[PDB]
């Protein structure tokens, strides 16, 4: 078995490309690299980029995305 | 402890019905439940708000997104109540 926390830790260690989907919001996504870790799914993510979904790119700085509104993580 | 949860647990085995917040009704053999209503079913149909049915083998469902669970009338008779 591989827990979610463990996975998160691994991702952090890596510093590989991550693409986050927002909760209750289909049209917008985020794409960055995981820097932080918390007890909840909340993580700080430098080099983030906002993406409008194909139903391309937009300018965006360094961000911490809150745990409550996460959907997807991948790295 | 939650009496509805207990009831649900008891219903384990029976052909229960199950609607979500989305409004998509399921009907089938109840496999397993937990403290939070983390239901599983077997040999289960799935009808959307439109009415188009879709059959499926094994479904798991999370209690938060569950609206209400219909049990057969047999468990009205006994015995966890008193």
């Amino acid at each position: 078995m591989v827990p979610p926390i463990n996975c998160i830790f691994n991702f952090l260690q890596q510093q590989t490309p991550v693409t986050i989907w927002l909760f209750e919001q289909i049209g917008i996504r985020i794409k960055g690299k995981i820097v932080g870790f918390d007890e909840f799914m909340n993580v700080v993510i430098d080099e983030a980029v906002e993406i409008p979904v194909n139903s391309k790119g937009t300018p965006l700085g360094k961000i911490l995305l809150k745990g409550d509104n996460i959907t997807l993580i991948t790295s | 402890n939650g009496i509805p949860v207990k009831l649900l647990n008891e219903a384990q085995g029976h052909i229960v019905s199950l609607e979500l917040t989305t409004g998509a009704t399921y009907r089938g053999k109840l496999v397993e439940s937990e403290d939070s209503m983390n239901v599983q079913l077997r040999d289960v149909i799935a009808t959307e708000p439109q009415g188009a049915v879709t059959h499926m083998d094994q479904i798991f469902v999370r209690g938060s997104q569950i609206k209400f669970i219909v049990v057969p009338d047999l468990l009205k008779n006994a015995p966890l109540f008193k």
């Binding site: 078995m1 591989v2 909760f23 997807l72 991948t74 | 917040t21 989305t22 798991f60």
Partner: protein
């Protein structure tokens, strides 16, 4: 308190029905008490793939229908 009994669904391909009428696919790798799924990545519902391995949050899950019996 109790762990989600998903040992039957371990290492099987599952259609995770998620918030906003969306869907995810993939083979099941791991899980925890909050129902945060860990699964090998697949296509989002014609169809197109993103990511290698994926970790889905518990709150977002509407359902998870087993593709493999």
């Amino acid at each position: 308190v109790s762990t989600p009994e998903l040992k039957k669904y371990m290492d099987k391909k599952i259609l995770l029905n998620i918030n906003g009428s969306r869907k995810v696919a993939g083979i099941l790798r791991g899980y925890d008490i909050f129902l945060n799924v860990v699964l090998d990545d697949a296509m989002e519902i014609n169809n197109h793939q993103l990511g290698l391995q994926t970790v889905i949050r518990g709150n977002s899950i509407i359902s998870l229908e087993a593709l493999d019996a």
